[PDB]
Amino acid sequence: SVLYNSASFSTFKCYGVSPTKLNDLCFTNVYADSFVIRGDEVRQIAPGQTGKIADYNYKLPDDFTGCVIAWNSNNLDSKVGGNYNYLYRLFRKSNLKPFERDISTEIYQAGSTPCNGVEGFNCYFPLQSYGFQPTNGVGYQPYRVVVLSFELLHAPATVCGPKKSTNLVKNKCVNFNFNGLTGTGVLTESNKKFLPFQ
């Protein structure tokens, strides 16, 4: 709940799971895929898109039950005159299944000649350079997209949400709820003690 109204993010789209219902919802495993892309590649990050980035680099499933966090830096990072720090794969001879990382520096084979090592014709370099420049427009700025993965398996979910606590009223016949025990009575002081493990 504090990560939604922090006034420090540009875009905040949630697919499947509503952004106002995950506060009190339990989750089994919570993942985070932090990466930086271009400006025009932000719209491609969606369950059901295609292209040269969402198909060969980061593949997204058909259905997604999570949120997409993405903001703008364009400062404290980037460079003037061109960005020569990060790279990104453009073409690939084979597809990739969703939720899979490719760390192989292979060579794309466009024609019928065998590549991988020898270049010159029909053997281009797939890893391309970015262009994060603060003197361009909006679609040429670096956007750090942090994709969250919300899974629900048979394992006991231990990641839920903090419950809001109230005050403590005594000497009144009001209703209370301690450890899921709904009761209505007077919470009078007591002198006797119980057990530390009960």
């Binding site: 073409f91 370099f125 262009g131 420049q133 361009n136 427009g137």
Partner: protein
Amino acid sequence: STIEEQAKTFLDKFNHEAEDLFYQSSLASWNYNTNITEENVQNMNNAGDKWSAFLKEQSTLAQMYPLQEIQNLTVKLQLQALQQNGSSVLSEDKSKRLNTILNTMSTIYSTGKVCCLLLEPGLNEIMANSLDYNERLWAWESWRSEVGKQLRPLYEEYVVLKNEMARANHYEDYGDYWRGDYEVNGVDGYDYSRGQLIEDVEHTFEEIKPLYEHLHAYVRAKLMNAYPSYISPIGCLPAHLLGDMWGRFWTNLYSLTVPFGQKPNIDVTDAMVDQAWDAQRIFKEAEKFFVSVGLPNMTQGFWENSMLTDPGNVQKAVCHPTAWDLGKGDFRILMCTKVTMDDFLTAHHEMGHIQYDMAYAAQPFLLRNGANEGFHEAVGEIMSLSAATPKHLKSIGLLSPDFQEDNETEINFLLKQALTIVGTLPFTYMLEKWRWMVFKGEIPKDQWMKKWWEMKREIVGVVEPVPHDETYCDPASLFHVSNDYSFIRYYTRTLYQFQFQEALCQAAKHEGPLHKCDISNSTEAGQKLFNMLRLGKSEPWTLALENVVGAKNMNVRPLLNYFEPLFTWLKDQNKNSFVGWSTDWSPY
């Protein structure tokens, strides 16, 4: 894989590397254009060397790709402008010799002194404000005897070398290279061969002659007051009485010809001094013109990187009115904007080119170019024409909402526009058709002066103010000839200016004349405008014309509607003298 699938891999590989090198070539040249520094000269040569070498090495790898197996009506047009032979198709001996001639003709034209006195604004004031017959004649006769003699031997070799270069790229003569851009071959339904471009202009020029005869007779009958003896009532006009050195720009003649002295043109210079205009409000009011019409807005970096102020005393440079396109979403304008009326009309000229480059923003680098050379300047003319109507300047901040359009006021407004738009139309049509016959063989190499002067009297109406010989050379001293450029882009610019204006003014409930139109708060006229701007190089120019006008051929009809009140006033005024000119008259 097939052929079209592997061809798309080379496109994304070249676009991701050419935009990085082209940005450094424009950024290195921008530093020299904003601050005079000897260190910026080396950065421009180093950035241009890598760009010139990378473009030639990538075009060789695309030579083996077949130019007839890719069908997509988009990728086919990109290979035609990349797999070209270029100027390097000849031998290594004639390649370095041809580049040397292009550097010598530009040095003499830029250093042409008359002893000293420079060309502009040196001899420009003598050929305009002088009011004498024996004073401005020496400034024109001495220019041909000094500049024309040094450019004569360099122009003879320019014809034979450029002719062989065009024959190696599967053409007939050198005239087909400039006309090859308009030629479309490979699409379906949008074909336009060279057999139609030869007849589209020769037909519309026959109907513009009655409009030119009334305009030429008004200038001839006006100079009879200053000197009756030197000016024949039925003759032509000397070459030293046209304002320009070459007789091309007739704008300087507006100061000597004034139809009405009671209702002059409007002046919005004093209206901006009181309303606080620090050379920043001009671009703010010009931004709204491209918002409520249906066009994309500006960017945040446009107001922080484009130098639109004054260099001051600590810095100094130049600021020629020309739009820049660094690429990758970077657009800058280098224009010294002051607080007057001259800078207000010219601000919308280069502003129209900014919206053009922003149209094909999501397109590859090989599609970020116009369909032809005569379309880039056509976008800036339709924006500056609507920015001069008194009705357009009324709804904004400057000017008075109490001013109305008068019949006598529009007479002086159409006179200054006829001496620039259609004022250079007969000179451009003559110079373009004259060079096309030299490479063919219809004009001998030793009969240039005998042919150039006899054609001016039959079309333009300029005789010989001083007898010469066959040694001088006039067309070699032109900015578009000594620097290797085409003049056909200016002829179609004047015709396409009124064709795109009539279509936008028709949906805005502004029919009839085009001088009273006002493109403002019209969402319908902006939708059809963005169609031809987004196409860029992706679609031929025949489709870009139909989406706005409706046809695929030029027409002189919209050009006459804008000059309809001017054509009527010149008919009832030039009837007292003579309508036409006698080619048999000579001042000598």
